[PDB]
Structure 1
């Protein structure tokens, strides 16, 4: 497998026996999540289960709107 040689003249060492895996290109894939367009959160419900559902739906709505607000800024790394 792996072997190593030390050169005293130049104070250096070389470790041989490795195999390559070089990133030479890029493959791009599109990952999608299907979303639901909801507007009517109307519910005259005081049940705690109803309140939990309302909280989780608000979280979903906030996530979607936050992603949209991110989308109004085009992607760029620097």
Structure 2
């Protein structure tokens, strides 16, 4: 198509012609904010008395968040 390659014996180099450019010269910065959909833990009794899943999912989360809060300084 548009992309052709040309050879040059004199300098033993080839040159791909046919491209159209786009030169980065600046940055554009958006601030994206995202909210959490939280889980209250209904307090009845389950099949297994030990298993506390809602607390173990929340704490697995509030943990990941603390490692990142600590990352930034």
TM-score normalised to structure 1 length: 0.67
Query: Would you say how many aligned residue pairs link Structure 1 and Structure 2?
Result: 72
Higher relative contact order (CA 8 A, sep 6+): 2
CA distance in 2, matches of 1:15, 1:24: 24
Gaps of 5+ in 2: none
Gaps of 5+ in 1: 73-78
Moved over 2 A (4+): 33-50
Aligned to 2:28, the other structure's residue is in SS state strand
Which one has the bigger helix percentage? 1
TM-score normalised to structure 2 length: 0.70
Aligned to 2:67, the other structure's residue is in SS state helix
